Amino acid sequence: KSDQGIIAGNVPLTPIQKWFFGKNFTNTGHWNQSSVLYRPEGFDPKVIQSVMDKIIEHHDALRMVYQHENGNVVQHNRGLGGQLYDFFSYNLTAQPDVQQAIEAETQRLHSSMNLQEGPLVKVALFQTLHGDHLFLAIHHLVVDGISWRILFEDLATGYAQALAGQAISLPEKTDSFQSWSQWLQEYANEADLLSEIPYWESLESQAKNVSLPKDYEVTDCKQKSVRNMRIRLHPEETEQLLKHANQAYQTEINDLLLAALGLAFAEWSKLAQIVIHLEGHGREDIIEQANVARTVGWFTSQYPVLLDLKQTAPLSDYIKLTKENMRKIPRKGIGYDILKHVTLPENRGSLSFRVQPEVTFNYLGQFDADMRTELFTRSPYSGGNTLGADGKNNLSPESEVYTALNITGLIEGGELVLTFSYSSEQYREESIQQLSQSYQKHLLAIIAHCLQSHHHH
Ligand code: NA
């Protein structure tokens, strides 16, 4: 029932895309996501090209191009017939240092996106004596985490079909990114979204907008200055957090992690309140009968949450209030950025959008999009090519830092691992050691409290 035909033509910018162009990043064409896959049997360049041809024909948004001269951004979905992706194949069988070759070339390709003409997809095959490595980089304008899951699924499906001598045949298309974006433009001025204005107005009015404290005053810090500091919970405490701690107050893991975040910022920053940038997948059921379940694009939603850091006691009430705070947000928070970037000024009430969070928090769950098929797995030579916090190759070193503290959590090897990413221009390493140790302490206290509370009741 969704459009199975070729999608082409102009596409309105969605909120996160308007955010992106509004930043006017240095080296705007180098702002990507990437991955490296490994197949011990080896990959065939001819099969890879056949499957990628079908993938990019099928997932129309990957054919997007962007004009932006004098700030006049035009997003256009190309039809078929042009360059669908850039493909390179390398014989590394003679090389002593395969890792060096892969990092150099993946970095070269990351820096080679032509936004105006495309393609926005780079593919490189590295053949070795011990299996082959397949690099993919895609500009972020046309992709997101869920989209990568879809792409890995379809790559596995098409490759298996090719190996079996069968025609490549992907799942039916869901609704186009073009159509989705057009529908969002309509939604932006309709009654359901406008009904949220009092909520968002209340948030803005409560937001004090006090500077997140930094160690040093610096302007135009760049990605090259960013450092990552990691803490983790052992498997025992991770399992308690995932499978037992939520019973006390019937929470989700994110509620407890956000509660910990408030406690840590209360201790470390001494602020009375803090606004945090959260993210949603953005594929919410806001458009009647829309279906973007297998649609490739940048759907990600960003929204603010206000944490009260004054009233952190008793811990029981603080956890319950954090849960309640999260439950009261309308429509998983998708509305605020639509109001900000798309809604007509006349429809936006008294919203001023002065809320500019410097802290982002994202809990990503389990780490495994690239590891569901027997055909390939995550490459041990992935290096700086990832979809997450360790993807040092994804952004230009001269790209501007856009968040002071980017905090991400994920489960790897049965352990919760939290990464605190910051600019070394703005903070001493010791300051972030203090924050991350505070976070760890408060999260452990929350887990202990929840286990005892559920015993008590
Ligand atoms: Na989140």
Short mmCIF file of all heavy atoms in Angstrom, two decimals, residues 33-88, unseen atoms left out:
data_model
loop_
_atom_site.label_atom_id
_atom_site.label_comp_id
_atom_site.label_asym_id
_atom_site.label_seq_id
_atom_site.Cartn_x
_atom_site.Cartn_y
_atom_site.Cartn_z
N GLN A 33 27.77 8.88 9.38
CA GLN A 33 27.81 7.67 10.17
C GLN A 33 28.48 6.61 9.33
O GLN A 33 28.49 6.71 8.11
CB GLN A 33 26.41 7.20 10.57
CG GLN A 33 25.78 8.08 11.64
CD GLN A 33 24.39 7.62 12.07
OE1 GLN A 33 23.55 7.26 11.25
NE2 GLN A 33 24.16 7.64 13.37
N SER A 34 29.02 5.58 9.97
CA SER A 34 29.76 4.58 9.23
C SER A 34 29.87 3.24 9.95
O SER A 34 29.56 3.13 11.14
CB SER A 34 31.15 5.13 8.86
OG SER A 34 31.91 5.46 10.00
N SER A 35 30.29 2.23 9.21
CA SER A 35 30.48 0.91 9.79
C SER A 35 31.44 0.12 8.92
O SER A 35 31.66 0.44 7.75
CB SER A 35 29.15 0.15 9.93
OG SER A 35 28.39 0.65 11.02
N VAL A 36 32.07 -0.87 9.54
CA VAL A 36 32.91 -1.80 8.79
C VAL A 36 32.44 -3.19 9.17
O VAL A 36 32.32 -3.52 10.36
CB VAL A 36 34.42 -1.65 9.06
CG1 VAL A 36 35.18 -2.55 8.11
CG2 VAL A 36 34.87 -0.21 8.87
N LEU A 37 32.12 -3.98 8.15
CA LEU A 37 31.64 -5.36 8.33
C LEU A 37 32.74 -6.33 7.93
O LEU A 37 33.58 -6.02 7.10
CB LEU A 37 30.40 -5.61 7.46
CG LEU A 37 29.29 -4.59 7.67
CD1 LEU A 37 28.16 -4.80 6.68
CD2 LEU A 37 28.77 -4.68 9.12
N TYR A 38 32.76 -7.49 8.56
CA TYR A 38 33.77 -8.51 8.30
C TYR A 38 33.11 -9.83 7.90
O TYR A 38 32.16 -10.27 8.54
CB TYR A 38 34.67 -8.68 9.52
CG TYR A 38 35.62 -9.85 9.43
CD1 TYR A 38 36.70 -9.81 8.57
CD2 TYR A 38 35.44 -10.96 10.23
CE1 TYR A 38 37.60 -10.88 8.49
CE2 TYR A 38 36.31 -12.03 10.16
CZ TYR A 38 37.39 -11.98 9.29
OH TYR A 38 38.26 -13.05 9.24
N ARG A 39 33.63 -10.44 6.83
CA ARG A 39 33.19 -11.75 6.36
C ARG A 39 34.42 -12.63 6.20
O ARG A 39 35.25 -12.39 5.31
CB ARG A 39 32.43 -11.63 5.04
CG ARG A 39 31.95 -12.93 4.45
CD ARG A 39 30.99 -12.66 3.28
NE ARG A 39 30.80 -13.84 2.46
CZ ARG A 39 30.00 -14.85 2.79
NH1 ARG A 39 29.31 -14.82 3.93
NH2 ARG A 39 29.89 -15.90 1.98
N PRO A 40 34.57 -13.64 7.07
CA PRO A 40 35.78 -14.47 6.97
C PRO A 40 35.96 -15.21 5.63
O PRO A 40 37.08 -15.43 5.21
CB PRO A 40 35.62 -15.45 8.15
CG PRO A 40 34.21 -15.37 8.59
CD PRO A 40 33.75 -13.98 8.25
N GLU A 41 34.85 -15.56 4.98
CA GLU A 41 34.88 -16.23 3.68
C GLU A 41 35.36 -15.30 2.57
O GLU A 41 35.80 -15.78 1.53
CB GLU A 41 33.47 -16.74 3.30
CG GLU A 41 32.91 -17.80 4.21
CD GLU A 41 32.00 -17.26 5.28
OE1 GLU A 41 32.20 -16.11 5.72
OE2 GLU A 41 31.08 -18.01 5.69
N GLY A 42 35.27 -13.99 2.81
CA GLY A 42 35.50 -12.97 1.79
C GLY A 42 34.19 -12.46 1.22
O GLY A 42 33.17 -13.15 1.29
N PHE A 43 34.24 -11.25 0.67
CA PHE A 43 33.16 -10.64 -0.09
C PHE A 43 33.53 -10.60 -1.56
O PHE A 43 34.72 -10.51 -1.92
CB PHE A 43 32.96 -9.18 0.33
CG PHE A 43 32.28 -8.98 1.65
CD1 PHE A 43 32.99 -8.46 2.73
CD2 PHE A 43 30.92 -9.24 1.80
CE1 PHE A 43 32.35 -8.20 3.95
CE2 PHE A 43 30.28 -8.98 3.02
CZ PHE A 43 31.00 -8.46 4.10
N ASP A 44 32.52 -10.64 -2.42
CA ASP A 44 32.69 -10.54 -3.87
C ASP A 44 32.33 -9.14 -4.30
O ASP A 44 31.20 -8.71 -4.04
CB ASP A 44 31.81 -11.59 -4.56
CG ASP A 44 31.82 -11.49 -6.07
OD1 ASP A 44 32.65 -10.76 -6.66
OD2 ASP A 44 31.01 -12.20 -6.70
N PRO A 45 33.26 -8.40 -4.94
CA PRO A 45 32.90 -7.04 -5.34
C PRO A 45 31.71 -6.97 -6.28
O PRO A 45 30.94 -6.02 -6.20
CB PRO A 45 34.17 -6.51 -6.05
CG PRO A 45 35.12 -7.61 -6.10
CD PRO A 45 34.68 -8.69 -5.18
N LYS A 46 31.56 -7.95 -7.17
CA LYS A 46 30.44 -7.93 -8.10
C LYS A 46 29.10 -8.11 -7.39
O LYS A 46 28.15 -7.39 -7.67
CB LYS A 46 30.64 -8.97 -9.21
CG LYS A 46 31.78 -8.61 -10.14
N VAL A 47 29.03 -9.04 -6.45
CA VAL A 47 27.82 -9.23 -5.64
C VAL A 47 27.54 -7.98 -4.79
O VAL A 47 26.41 -7.54 -4.69
CB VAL A 47 27.92 -10.47 -4.74
CG1 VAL A 47 26.71 -10.55 -3.79
CG2 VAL A 47 28.02 -11.74 -5.59
N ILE A 48 28.58 -7.41 -4.17
CA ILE A 48 28.38 -6.19 -3.38
C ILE A 48 27.77 -5.09 -4.22
O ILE A 48 26.84 -4.42 -3.79
CB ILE A 48 29.71 -5.70 -2.74
CG1 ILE A 48 30.12 -6.64 -1.60
CG2 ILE A 48 29.56 -4.23 -2.23
CD1 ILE A 48 29.21 -6.64 -0.40
N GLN A 49 28.28 -4.90 -5.44
CA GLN A 49 27.73 -3.87 -6.30
C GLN A 49 26.29 -4.16 -6.70
O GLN A 49 25.44 -3.26 -6.67
CB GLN A 49 28.64 -3.65 -7.51
CG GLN A 49 29.94 -2.96 -7.13
CD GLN A 49 30.91 -2.84 -8.28
OE1 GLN A 49 30.98 -1.81 -8.94
NE2 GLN A 49 31.63 -3.91 -8.56
N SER A 50 25.98 -5.41 -7.03
CA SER A 50 24.60 -5.77 -7.37
C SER A 50 23.64 -5.47 -6.21
O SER A 50 22.57 -4.89 -6.41
CB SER A 50 24.50 -7.23 -7.76
OG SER A 50 25.28 -7.46 -8.92
N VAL A 51 24.03 -5.85 -5.00
CA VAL A 51 23.16 -5.67 -3.84
C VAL A 51 23.04 -4.19 -3.50
O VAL A 51 21.96 -3.71 -3.23
CB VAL A 51 23.64 -6.50 -2.64
CG1 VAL A 51 22.82 -6.19 -1.39
CG2 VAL A 51 23.57 -7.97 -3.00
N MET A 52 24.16 -3.47 -3.51
CA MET A 52 24.11 -2.04 -3.20
C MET A 52 23.30 -1.28 -4.23
O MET A 52 22.62 -0.32 -3.88
CB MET A 52 25.51 -1.43 -3.09
CG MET A 52 26.28 -1.85 -1.88
SD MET A 52 25.46 -1.64 -0.27
CE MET A 52 25.06 0.10 -0.30
N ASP A 53 23.38 -1.69 -5.50
CA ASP A 53 22.55 -1.09 -6.54
C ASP A 53 21.09 -1.19 -6.14
O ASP A 53 20.35 -0.20 -6.15
CB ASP A 53 22.73 -1.79 -7.89
CG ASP A 53 24.03 -1.42 -8.61
OD1 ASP A 53 24.76 -0.50 -8.15
OD2 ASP A 53 24.30 -2.07 -9.64
N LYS A 54 20.67 -2.40 -5.76
CA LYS A 54 19.28 -2.62 -5.38
C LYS A 54 18.90 -1.84 -4.10
O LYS A 54 17.82 -1.27 -4.01
CB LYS A 54 18.99 -4.11 -5.23
CG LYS A 54 19.09 -4.88 -6.53
CD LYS A 54 17.99 -4.49 -7.53
CE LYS A 54 17.99 -5.38 -8.76
NZ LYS A 54 16.82 -5.10 -9.65
N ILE A 55 19.80 -1.81 -3.12
CA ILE A 55 19.54 -1.11 -1.87
C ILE A 55 19.29 0.37 -2.09
O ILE A 55 18.36 0.95 -1.52
CB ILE A 55 20.70 -1.34 -0.87
CG1 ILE A 55 20.55 -2.73 -0.26
CG2 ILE A 55 20.70 -0.28 0.25
CD1 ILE A 55 21.70 -3.14 0.63
N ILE A 56 20.09 0.99 -2.95
CA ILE A 56 20.00 2.44 -3.14
C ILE A 56 18.87 2.81 -4.11
O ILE A 56 18.29 3.88 -3.99
CB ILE A 56 21.37 3.03 -3.52
CG1 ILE A 56 22.29 2.89 -2.29
CG2 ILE A 56 21.25 4.52 -3.95
CD1 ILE A 56 23.76 3.06 -2.58
N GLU A 57 18.55 1.92 -5.04
CA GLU A 57 17.30 2.05 -5.80
C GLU A 57 16.06 1.98 -4.90
O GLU A 57 15.10 2.73 -5.09
CB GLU A 57 17.23 1.00 -6.90
CG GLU A 57 18.26 1.24 -8.01
CD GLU A 57 18.25 0.20 -9.10
OE1 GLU A 57 17.51 -0.81 -9.00
OE2 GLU A 57 18.97 0.42 -10.09
N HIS A 58 16.10 1.07 -3.92
CA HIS A 58 14.98 0.78 -3.03
C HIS A 58 14.75 1.79 -1.92
O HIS A 58 13.63 2.12 -1.58
CB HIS A 58 15.21 -0.59 -2.41
CG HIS A 58 14.02 -1.14 -1.70
ND1 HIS A 58 12.95 -1.70 -2.36
CD2 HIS A 58 13.75 -1.24 -0.38
CE1 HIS A 58 12.08 -2.15 -1.47
NE2 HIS A 58 12.53 -1.87 -0.26
N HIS A 59 15.85 2.27 -1.34
CA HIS A 59 15.80 3.16 -0.19
C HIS A 59 16.10 4.55 -0.70
O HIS A 59 17.24 5.05 -0.61
CB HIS A 59 16.77 2.69 0.88
CG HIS A 59 16.34 1.42 1.56
ND1 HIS A 59 15.24 1.37 2.39
CD2 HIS A 59 16.84 0.17 1.51
CE1 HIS A 59 15.10 0.13 2.83
NE2 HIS A 59 16.05 -0.62 2.31
N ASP A 60 15.04 5.18 -1.18
CA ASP A 60 15.18 6.35 -2.07
C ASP A 60 15.97 7.52 -1.46
O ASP A 60 16.68 8.21 -2.18
CB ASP A 60 13.82 6.83 -2.54
CG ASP A 60 13.06 5.74 -3.29
OD1 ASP A 60 12.49 4.87 -2.59
OD2 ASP A 60 13.09 5.71 -4.54
N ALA A 61 15.82 7.75 -0.16
CA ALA A 61 16.47 8.92 0.47
C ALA A 61 17.98 8.89 0.38
O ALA A 61 18.61 9.94 0.46
CB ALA A 61 16.05 9.08 1.94
N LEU A 62 18.57 7.70 0.17
CA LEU A 62 20.02 7.60 0.00
C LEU A 62 20.51 8.30 -1.27
O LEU A 62 21.70 8.56 -1.40
CB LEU A 62 20.48 6.13 0.07
CG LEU A 62 20.27 5.43 1.40
CD1 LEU A 62 20.74 3.97 1.27
CD2 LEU A 62 20.99 6.16 2.55
N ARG A 63 19.60 8.61 -2.17
CA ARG A 63 19.92 9.34 -3.41
C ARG A 63 19.75 10.87 -3.30
O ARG A 63 19.80 11.58 -4.32
CB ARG A 63 19.05 8.84 -4.56
CG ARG A 63 19.24 7.38 -4.84
CD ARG A 63 18.57 6.96 -6.15
NE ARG A 63 17.17 7.38 -6.25
CZ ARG A 63 16.11 6.69 -5.86
NH1 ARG A 63 16.22 5.47 -5.33
NH2 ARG A 63 14.91 7.22 -6.04
N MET A 64 19.59 11.36 -2.08
CA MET A 64 19.40 12.79 -1.87
C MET A 64 20.64 13.59 -2.23
O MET A 64 21.78 13.12 -2.10
CB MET A 64 19.04 13.06 -0.41
CG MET A 64 18.11 14.23 -0.23
SD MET A 64 16.44 13.80 -0.67
CE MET A 64 15.94 12.85 0.76
N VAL A 65 20.41 14.82 -2.67
CA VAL A 65 21.46 15.83 -2.79
C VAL A 65 20.92 17.12 -2.18
O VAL A 65 19.70 17.27 -1.96
CB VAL A 65 21.87 16.06 -4.26
CG1 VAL A 65 22.51 14.80 -4.85
CG2 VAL A 65 20.68 16.51 -5.10
N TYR A 66 21.85 18.03 -1.90
CA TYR A 66 21.58 19.30 -1.18
C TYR A 66 22.30 20.46 -1.85
O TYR A 66 23.50 20.46 -1.98
CB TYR A 66 22.03 19.22 0.29
CG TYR A 66 21.31 18.15 1.06
CD1 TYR A 66 21.72 16.83 0.98
CD2 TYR A 66 20.15 18.41 1.81
CE1 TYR A 66 21.05 15.84 1.61
CE2 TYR A 66 19.49 17.41 2.48
CZ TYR A 66 19.92 16.12 2.36
OH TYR A 66 19.23 15.11 2.98
N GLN A 67 21.55 21.48 -2.22
CA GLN A 67 22.14 22.80 -2.56
C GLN A 67 22.07 23.73 -1.34
O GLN A 67 21.10 23.65 -0.59
CB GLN A 67 21.39 23.38 -3.74
CG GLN A 67 21.58 22.60 -5.07
CD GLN A 67 21.16 21.13 -5.03
OE1 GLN A 67 21.97 20.23 -5.26
NE2 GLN A 67 19.89 20.88 -4.74
N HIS A 68 23.07 24.59 -1.09
CA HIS A 68 22.97 25.54 0.04
C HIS A 68 23.63 26.90 -0.19
O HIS A 68 24.03 27.58 0.78
CB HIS A 68 23.49 24.90 1.35
CG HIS A 68 24.91 24.41 1.29
ND1 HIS A 68 25.98 25.26 1.12
CD2 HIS A 68 25.42 23.17 1.42
CE1 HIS A 68 27.10 24.55 1.11
NE2 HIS A 68 26.79 23.28 1.30
N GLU A 69 23.72 27.33 -1.44
CA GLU A 69 24.42 28.58 -1.76
C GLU A 69 23.66 29.75 -1.15
O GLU A 69 22.43 29.82 -1.25
CB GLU A 69 24.62 28.76 -3.27
CG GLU A 69 25.62 27.79 -3.90
CD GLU A 69 26.97 27.76 -3.18
OE1 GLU A 69 27.66 28.81 -3.15
OE2 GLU A 69 27.34 26.70 -2.63
N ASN A 70 24.40 30.63 -0.46
CA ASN A 70 23.82 31.79 0.23
C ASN A 70 22.75 31.41 1.27
O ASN A 70 21.91 32.24 1.63
CB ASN A 70 23.28 32.80 -0.78
CG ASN A 70 24.37 33.48 -1.59
OD1 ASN A 70 24.20 33.77 -2.77
ND2 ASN A 70 25.50 33.74 -0.96
N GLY A 71 22.80 30.18 1.76
CA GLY A 71 21.85 29.71 2.77
C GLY A 71 20.50 29.26 2.24
O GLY A 71 19.57 29.04 3.03
N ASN A 72 20.39 29.13 0.91
CA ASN A 72 19.17 28.66 0.24
C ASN A 72 19.22 27.15 0.09
O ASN A 72 19.53 26.66 -0.98
CB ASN A 72 19.04 29.25 -1.17
CG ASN A 72 18.77 30.76 -1.19
OD1 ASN A 72 18.54 31.38 -0.15
ND2 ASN A 72 18.79 31.34 -2.38
N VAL A 73 18.91 26.40 1.14
CA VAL A 73 19.09 24.96 1.10
C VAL A 73 17.95 24.29 0.33
O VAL A 73 16.78 24.53 0.65
CB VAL A 73 19.15 24.38 2.52
CG1 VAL A 73 19.47 22.90 2.44
CG2 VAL A 73 20.20 25.13 3.36
N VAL A 74 18.29 23.51 -0.69
CA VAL A 74 17.31 22.71 -1.43
C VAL A 74 17.66 21.23 -1.37
O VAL A 74 18.72 20.81 -1.87
CB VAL A 74 17.23 23.12 -2.90
CG1 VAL A 74 16.24 22.25 -3.62
CG2 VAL A 74 16.81 24.56 -2.99
N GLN A 75 16.77 20.45 -0.76
CA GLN A 75 16.95 19.02 -0.59
C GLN A 75 16.18 18.34 -1.70
O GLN A 75 14.97 18.55 -1.84
CB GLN A 75 16.43 18.58 0.78
CG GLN A 75 16.47 17.07 0.97
CD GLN A 75 16.05 16.61 2.34
OE1 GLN A 75 16.61 15.65 2.90
NE2 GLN A 75 15.03 17.27 2.90
N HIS A 76 16.87 17.55 -2.51
CA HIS A 76 16.29 16.95 -3.70
C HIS A 76 16.59 15.46 -3.75
O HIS A 76 17.75 15.05 -3.67
CB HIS A 76 16.87 17.62 -4.93
CG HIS A 76 16.34 17.09 -6.22
ND1 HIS A 76 15.15 17.52 -6.76
CD2 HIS A 76 16.84 16.18 -7.08
CE1 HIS A 76 14.93 16.89 -7.90
NE2 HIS A 76 15.94 16.07 -8.12
N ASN A 77 15.55 14.66 -3.91
CA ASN A 77 15.71 13.22 -4.03
C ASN A 77 15.93 12.89 -5.51
O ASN A 77 15.03 13.03 -6.32
CB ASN A 77 14.48 12.51 -3.45
CG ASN A 77 14.76 11.10 -2.99
OD1 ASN A 77 14.36 10.73 -1.90
ND2 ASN A 77 15.47 10.31 -3.79
N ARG A 78 17.15 12.49 -5.89
CA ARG A 78 17.41 12.10 -7.26
C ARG A 78 16.60 10.87 -7.62
O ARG A 78 16.31 10.05 -6.76
CB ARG A 78 18.89 11.78 -7.48
CG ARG A 78 19.80 12.97 -7.31
CD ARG A 78 21.26 12.56 -7.43
NE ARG A 78 21.71 11.63 -6.40
CZ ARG A 78 22.64 10.68 -6.57
NH1 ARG A 78 23.21 10.46 -7.74
NH2 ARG A 78 22.96 9.89 -5.55
N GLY A 79 16.28 10.75 -8.91
CA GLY A 79 15.72 9.50 -9.44
C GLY A 79 16.84 8.49 -9.67
O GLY A 79 17.89 8.55 -9.02
N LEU A 80 16.62 7.57 -10.60
CA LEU A 80 17.60 6.55 -10.89
C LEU A 80 18.47 7.00 -12.05
O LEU A 80 18.20 8.02 -12.68
CB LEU A 80 16.90 5.23 -11.23
CG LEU A 80 15.98 4.64 -10.14
CD1 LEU A 80 15.60 3.19 -10.49
CD2 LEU A 80 16.57 4.71 -8.75
N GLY A 81 19.53 6.25 -12.31
CA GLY A 81 20.37 6.45 -13.49
C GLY A 81 21.72 7.09 -13.24
O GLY A 81 22.62 6.95 -14.06
N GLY A 82 21.86 7.80 -12.12
CA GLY A 82 23.10 8.51 -11.80
C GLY A 82 24.03 7.66 -10.95
O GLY A 82 23.90 6.43 -10.92
N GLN A 83 24.97 8.31 -10.28
CA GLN A 83 25.91 7.62 -9.40
C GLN A 83 25.22 7.29 -8.07
O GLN A 83 24.87 8.20 -7.31
CB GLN A 83 27.17 8.49 -9.17
CG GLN A 83 28.31 7.84 -8.37
CD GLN A 83 29.27 7.00 -9.21
OE1 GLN A 83 30.33 6.58 -8.73
NE2 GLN A 83 28.91 6.76 -10.47
N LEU A 84 24.99 6.01 -7.80
CA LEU A 84 24.22 5.63 -6.62
C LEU A 84 25.08 5.61 -5.37
O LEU A 84 24.58 5.81 -4.25
CB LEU A 84 23.57 4.26 -6.82
CG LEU A 84 22.57 4.11 -7.97
CD1 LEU A 84 22.04 2.69 -7.99
CD2 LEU A 84 21.43 5.12 -7.82
N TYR A 85 26.36 5.31 -5.55
CA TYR A 85 27.34 5.24 -4.46
C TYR A 85 28.71 5.23 -5.13
O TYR A 85 28.82 4.94 -6.34
CB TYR A 85 27.15 3.98 -3.59
CG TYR A 85 27.14 2.69 -4.39
CD1 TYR A 85 28.29 1.92 -4.54
CD2 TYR A 85 25.97 2.26 -5.00
CE1 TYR A 85 28.27 0.76 -5.29
CE2 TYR A 85 25.94 1.10 -5.74
CZ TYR A 85 27.09 0.36 -5.88
OH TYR A 85 27.07 -0.78 -6.64
N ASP A 86 29.75 5.57 -4.37
CA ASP A 86 31.12 5.43 -4.84
C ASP A 86 31.66 4.13 -4.29
O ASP A 86 31.55 3.87 -3.10
CB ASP A 86 31.99 6.60 -4.40
CG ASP A 86 31.60 7.90 -5.07
OD1 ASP A 86 31.19 7.86 -6.26
OD2 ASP A 86 31.71 8.95 -4.42
N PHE A 87 32.23 3.31 -5.16
CA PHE A 87 32.69 2.00 -4.78
C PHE A 87 34.18 1.85 -5.07
O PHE A 87 34.64 2.19 -6.17
CB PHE A 87 31.93 0.89 -5.52
CG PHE A 87 32.39 -0.50 -5.16
CD1 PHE A 87 32.06 -1.06 -3.94
CD2 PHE A 87 33.19 -1.22 -6.03
CE1 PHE A 87 32.50 -2.34 -3.59
CE2 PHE A 87 33.62 -2.50 -5.70
CZ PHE A 87 33.27 -3.06 -4.48
N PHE A 88 34.90 1.33 -4.09
CA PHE A 88 36.33 1.04 -4.20
C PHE A 88 36.63 -0.34 -3.66
O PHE A 88 36.02 -0.79 -2.70
CB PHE A 88 37.15 2.05 -3.41
CG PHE A 88 36.90 3.46 -3.82
CD1 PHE A 88 35.88 4.20 -3.23
CD2 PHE A 88 37.66 4.04 -4.81
CE1 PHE A 88 35.65 5.51 -3.63
CE2 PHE A 88 37.43 5.34 -5.20
CZ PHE A 88 36.43 6.07 -4.61
#
